[PDB]
């Protein structure tokens, strides 16, 4: 299904991403093994997957305790308020009572 | 007279006579087909799981009048086979209790949880047998086994009015008082006889006067030791409960429950919608029937000084009988053809 | 709304929907109990592929040992019976033991043969999780594994569900490797006995056993006739019960004494020790045996109407053994004593 | 006193049990591939654990293997596989190993010892037990299932995301490699609630921890930690014979790092039982009893004890296996 | 602070004290007994706070405290992790007729009664105004459970007749 890619493995060494390393964007950051390449299919590089395909990397939900948070929206946690940018939880710090 | 079950292990025949029998199957509280003459009814006392003492013990009662059943059990009462003779049944729910009435004489009070008395007038004299006594005026000869014999303790006494011949009877307790679970620690024993020593310290003393709190002290040590209560209390205000509505019907009503002594509430069931119109309170004893569109007539209730959460609405717009909320009398029944509610 | 599974006959196992297969094992297997909010469990004990002892297991107290002899145990102690406890009333049927548990809903035999058979109630639909398989209508699925997987080999579903305890560990169960002149399993097929329990169940699978039964034949008439009280069990439960069968070549099923075994036989088993309470009998048709009509039963046996024994303070005395008070005394007559 | 950071340590053992480099400890029980740790600051090493079922049952975890990766060689480097066999980049080789800066080495008591440059020290053992030491340099640029290799254990539950989360199912799930790996849900606290039978023997097995044996360790190290997960594996894995002894051993060694020894090995419990013309003596100091050390002489002799299989003082061991 | 206490010595045994595991048919009350901290109510509670040390707190202090009459030994701890649990927003109820129940109605003015001006909240915020101090004030519970009076906004509480 368009604009879906696919991709070969030279064989060489084995170092490609085949599809054994699809780039969720919960797993960017986290580093990808590859046990060989595997001939498959992934979306760009500059695209990451998401549940349903592969959207924009700058809009994948940030993830506090098992539950979905849309870019922008923010969340008090007892004594401050964080809001996630970058997928990145960012916030001030206040040592309260 | 009154035959009634003090706690939940031991027992109080017509004539007056305490005694002690813990059993796990069904048996006979009081009949009357065992004399030279057409038996007419039959109540069972079958208990779940209350050899020991424990909170789990469950009881159940089921009553044979003529052809139906009632099983008392956990909750209400039940019909499972409608009486020709529904004339005089009347099921009252007043205070915290249960009231029954099945003949001209019979009645049964239930507190729902695990005390029972059985009310007969002095018409069944000298023609009722079971674990009650024959009800003639006599304690001595009120221990006599089924087959015509008097025992002489009650271990064996009540293994032969057992129904179902497969209950590996009870056998015995050799040991006094001070059941195993006691006696072994004087650390618990040395609180439970202080804890429910109050049956003699303050409010009971004109009760004293009265009736000797001697049997009812026994009893509180005794399922109190053998009962590991653990976040329910319920085990311990029974007797005192019982107590106190002995002392009751000498008309020397007593009021002992503190904020921190078995204390209890009927607020729960106020009205949650608005709630502000407080219907409810907690009354000394809250005389027994009060008239309503269910029986609009006094009636023969044998208590009149039943424990509990009442209501005490203005002489005008008297209870209603199923959202629990006081109306105007427009909503009794249209008519009592068929003895339906009608609305 | 109650299902029935059943161990018979030598390493033979029947589920709560029909599915049914062989097995021997050594490490006291799970028979029932959901693998959720367990509660209790129900576990039956092998010992050289036999069939010995079964047991329950109520949270983590409470044991209670049935074996097959009649011996009841406590866990470390030898109780009598009938025993009644907390719940799980130990009792004695037709000739058969029997162990009920109604607080939580479930009632195991052992008769003569040692044939287990366990009685669940409906709250436990869709949740039974142990070896007698899923309780669901559907008939198919019933080999899930503990791991939730489904497999087809029965020894590979059934070894799944073993059960080890400090000293007792036991090892895999393999198929035993050993194979093989009359064939009177048609009998399920040919006689109008049976022809009426045909609409209801499919005999095939019990001839199926028969014949690999009929391979070992041990012995002369043994080859089929364990494998025919199941069946009509079996299609007795299912709504109609089979009357006055075993008329025609079982082999009489086996009970101490009376031998008076027949269908629709009264749970109540009225005795001369009782009240005669009527009315109150309203248990179901149970299969079992008893002796004759003019004789009433005692604890061991049961004697002819005018032998009840007087009974005083738990001591037995026969008819006319007058017994002696300080005041007074008097005679025993049928049980009354005047 | 004077505070100084020391090194760290990161242990997983058991069925699935936890203790994070500061000293948090836990059980996850989950069925995937998982980071262990990694530097996190200058990217210089990685550790990925795999795990899978044992002992057919729902609360039984394992470990099958752990790979570690050097970006300093550029290649996904030894993976320790199940077996006491290492892989280089997918090819067996046999020990030990030199290279320019790796280490890889059998040691006395049947496990393997991978070290780097003066520090990230891992001892692996074929059945599922790891142990990572790690230098004083790492003090705080570490994340991963470890935790950072900070002072403080109250924050050990830090997700990537930069947030600690309460309960663990919700921290753990946040390390997985695939996608596929379904996130577990509610973490089983009592096994052997479904394995009645198990009950008594667990209980009274368990429980030489608080008994006098013991006693000179009490106040080295609590054993509050050591007895739950003494009787959550007795309870859960299939055979409880050596799954006691593979819980007390663990007890042994942590006390052993502080110093204090203890026996506990007597007739009726799984004692070493080490093949005949060896010995089961407690410290001997494993530098030479290997005349690989004979031939080299003067390349190291700095060991504590080890209290393995050993020989009369009068034996080297033999290439085949013997002492003779 | 003095030197003349008795030093606790220790206890060398493990969970479930001597007072449990005695007789094992207590110690199987207790652990199911409060088990409600994550029975019907507090399955939003435990999103936010593990309920590990409340329960181990439970199952101490049950067995070795005993009880006659007084079931006070035990709803203190369920009351302390509502506590917790209000702190965080989140208020919850447990109480019922058939478990710790509570009445403060006693209280009422027994003159005539029918003024019923108490009841039983959960939450409740916790610093009002009255002629004590009727002035804003800084209280970090701000909800304290209790039974609390609400009558209407006029008419505002008094202080010693109450
Ligand atoms: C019904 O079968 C069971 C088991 O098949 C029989 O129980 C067994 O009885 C024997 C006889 O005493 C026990 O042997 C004894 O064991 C003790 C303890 O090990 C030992 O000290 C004695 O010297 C003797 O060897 C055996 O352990 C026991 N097995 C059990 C309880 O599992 C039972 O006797 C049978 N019933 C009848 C009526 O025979
Ligand atoms: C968080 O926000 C502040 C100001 O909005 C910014 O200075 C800081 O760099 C942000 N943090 C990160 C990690 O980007
Ligand atoms: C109980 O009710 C009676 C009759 O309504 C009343 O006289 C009495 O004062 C009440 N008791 C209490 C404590 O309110
Ligand atoms: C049994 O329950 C499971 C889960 O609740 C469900 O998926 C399945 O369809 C059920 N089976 C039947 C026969 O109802
Ligand atoms: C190691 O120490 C010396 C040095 O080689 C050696 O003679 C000795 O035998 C070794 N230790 C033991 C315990 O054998
Ligand atoms: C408790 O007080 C608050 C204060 O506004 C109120 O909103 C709430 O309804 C009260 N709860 C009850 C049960 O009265
Ligand atoms: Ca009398
Ligand atoms: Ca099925
Ligand atoms: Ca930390």
Redesign the pocket.
């Known amino acids: 299904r368009p604009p879906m890619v696919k991709l070969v493995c030279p064989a060489d060494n084995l170092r490609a991403e085949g599809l054994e390393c699809t780039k969720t964007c919960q797993n960017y950051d986290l580093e990808c093994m590859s046990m060989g390449c595997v001939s498959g299919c992934l979306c760009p590089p500059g695209m990451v997957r998401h549940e349903n395909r592969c959207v924009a990397l700058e809009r994948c939900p940030c993830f506090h305790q098992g539950k979905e948070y849309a870019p922008g929206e923010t969340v008090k946690i007892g004594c401050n308020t964080c809001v996630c940018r970058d997928r990145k939880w960012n916030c001030t710090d206040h040592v309260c009572d | 007279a009154t035959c009634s079950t003090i706690g939940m292990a031991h027992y109080l025949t017509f004539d007056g006579l305490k005694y002690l029998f813990p059993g796990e199957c069904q048996y006979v509280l009081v009949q009357d087909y065992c004399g030279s003459n057409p038996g007419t009814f039959r109540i069972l006392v079958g208990n779940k799981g209350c050899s020991h003492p424990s909170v789990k013990c469950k009881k159940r009662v089921t009553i044979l009048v003529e052809g139906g059943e009632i099983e008392l059990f956990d909750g209400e009462v039940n019909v499972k086979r409608p009486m020709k003779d529904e004339t005089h049944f009347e099921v009252v729910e007043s205070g915290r209790y249960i009231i029954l009435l099945l003949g001209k004489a019979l009645s049964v009070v239930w507190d729902r949880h695990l005390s029972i008395s059985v009310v007969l007038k002095q018409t069944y004299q000298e023609k009722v047998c079971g674990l009650c006594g024959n009800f003639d005026g006599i304690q001595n000869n009120d221990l006599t086994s089924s087959n015509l014999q008097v025992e002489e303790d009650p271990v064996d006494f009540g293994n032969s009015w057992k129904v179902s011949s497969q209950c590996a009877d009870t056998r015995k307790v050799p040991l006094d008082s001070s059941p195993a679970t006691c006696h072994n620690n004087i650390m618990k024993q040395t609180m439970v006889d202080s804890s429910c020593r109050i049956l003699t310290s303050d409010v009971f003393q004109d009760c004293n006067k009265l009736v000797d709190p001697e049997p009812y002290l026994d009893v509180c040590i005794y399922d109190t030791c053998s009962c590991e209560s653990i976040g329910d209390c319920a085990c311990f205000c029974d007797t005192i409960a019982a107590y106190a509505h002995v002392c009751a019907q000498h008309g020397k009503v007593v009021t002992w429950r503190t904020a921190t002594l078995c204390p209890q509430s009927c607020e729960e069931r106020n009205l949650r919608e608005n709630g502000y119109e407080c219907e409810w309170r907690y009354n000394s004893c809250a005389p027994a029937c009060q008239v309503t569109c269910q029986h609009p007539e006094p009636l023969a209730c044998p208590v009149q000084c039943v424990e509990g959460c009442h209501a005490h609405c203005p002489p005008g717009k008297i209870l209603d009988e199923l959202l629990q909320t006081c109306v105007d009398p427009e909503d009794c029944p249209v008519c009592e053809v068929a003895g339906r509610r009608f609305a | 709304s109650t299902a029935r599974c059943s161990l018979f006959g030598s390493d033979f196992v029947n589920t709560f929907d029909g599915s049914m297969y062989s097995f021997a094992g050594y490490c006291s297997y799970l028979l029932a109990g959901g693998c959720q909010k367990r509660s209790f469990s129900i576990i039956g004990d092998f010992q050289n592929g036999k069939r010995?002892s079964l047991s329950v297991y109520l949270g983590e107290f409470f044991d209670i040992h049935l074996?097959?002899?009649?011996?009841v145990?406590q866990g470390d102690q030898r109780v009598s019976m009938p025993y009644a406890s907390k719940g799980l009333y130990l009792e004695t049927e037709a000739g058969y033991y029997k162990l009920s548990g109604e607080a939580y809903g479930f009632v195991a035999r052992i008769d003569g043969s040692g044939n287990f058979q366990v009685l669940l109630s409906d709250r436990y639909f869709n949740k039974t999780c142990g070896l007698c398989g899923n309780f669901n209508i559907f008939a198919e699925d019933d080999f899930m594994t503990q791991e939730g997987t489904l497999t087809s080999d029965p020894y590979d579903f059934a070894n799944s569900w073993a059960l080890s305890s400090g000293e007792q560990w036991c090892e895999r169960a393999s198929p035993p490797s050993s194979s093989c002149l009359w064939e009177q399993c048609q009998l399920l097929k040919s006689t109008s006995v049976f022809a009426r329990c045909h609409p209801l169940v499919d005999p095939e699978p019990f001839v199926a056993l028969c014949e690999k039964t009929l391979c070992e034949c041990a012995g002369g008439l043994e080859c089929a006739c364990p494998a025919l009280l199941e069946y009509a069990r079996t299609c007795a439960q299912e709504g109609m019960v089979l009357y006055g069968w075993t008329d025609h070549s079982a082999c009489s099923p086996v009970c101490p004494a009376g031998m008076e075994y027949r269908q629709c036989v009264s749970p109540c088993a009225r005795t001369c020790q009782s009240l005669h309470i009527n009315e109150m009998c309203q248990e179901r048709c149970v299969d079992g045996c008893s002796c004759p009509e003019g004789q009433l039963l005692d604890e061991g046996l049961c004697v002819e109407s005018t032998e009840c024994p007087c009974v005083h303070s738990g001591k037995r005395y026969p008819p006319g053994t007058s017994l002696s008070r300080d005041c007074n005394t008097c005679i025993c007559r049928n049980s009354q004593w005047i | 006193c004077s505070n100084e950071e020391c090194p760290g340590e990161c242990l997983v053992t058991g069925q699935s049990h936890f203790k994070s480099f500061d000293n948090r400890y836990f059980t996850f029980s989950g069925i995937c591939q998982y980071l262990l740790a990694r530097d996190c600051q200058d990217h210089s090493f990685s550790i990925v654990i795999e795990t899978v079922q044992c002992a057919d049952d729902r609360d039984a975890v394992c470990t099958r293997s752990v790979t570690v990766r050097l970006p300093g060689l550029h290649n996904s480097l030894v993976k320790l596989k199940h077996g006491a066999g290492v892989a280089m980049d997918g090819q067996d080789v046999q020990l030990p190993l030199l290279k320019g800066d790796l280490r890889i080495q059998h040691t006395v008591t049947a496990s393997v010892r991978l070290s780097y440059g003066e520090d990230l020290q891992m001892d692996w053992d074929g059945r599922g037990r790891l142990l990572v030491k790690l230098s004083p340099v790492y003090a705080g640029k570490t994340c991963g299932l470890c935790g950072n290799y900070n002072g403080n254990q109250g924050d050990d539950f830090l997700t990537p995301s930069g947030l600690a989360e309460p309960r663990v199912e919700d921290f753990g799930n946040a390390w997985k490699l695939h996608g596929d790996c379904q996130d577990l849900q509610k973490q089983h606290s009592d096994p052997c609630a479904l394995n009645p039978r198990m009950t008594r023997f667990s209980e009274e097995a368990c429980a030489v921890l608080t008994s006098p044996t013991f006693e000179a360790c009490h106040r080295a190290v609590s054993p509050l930690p050591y007895l739950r997960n003494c009787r959550y594996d007795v309870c859960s894995c299939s055979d409880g014979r050596e799954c006691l002894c593979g819980a007390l051993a663990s007890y042994a060694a942590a006390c052993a790092g502080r110093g204090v020894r203890v026996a506990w090995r007597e007739p009726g419990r799984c004692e070493l039982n080490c093949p005949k013309g060896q010995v089961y003596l407690q410290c001997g100091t494993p530098c030479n009893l290997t005349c690989r050390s004979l031939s080299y002489p003067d390349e190291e002799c700095n060991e504590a004890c080890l209290e393995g299989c050993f020989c009369p003082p009068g034996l080297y061991m033999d290439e085949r296996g013997d002492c003779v």
Do not use: R
């Open positions: 010995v074996f097959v002899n009649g011996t145990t």
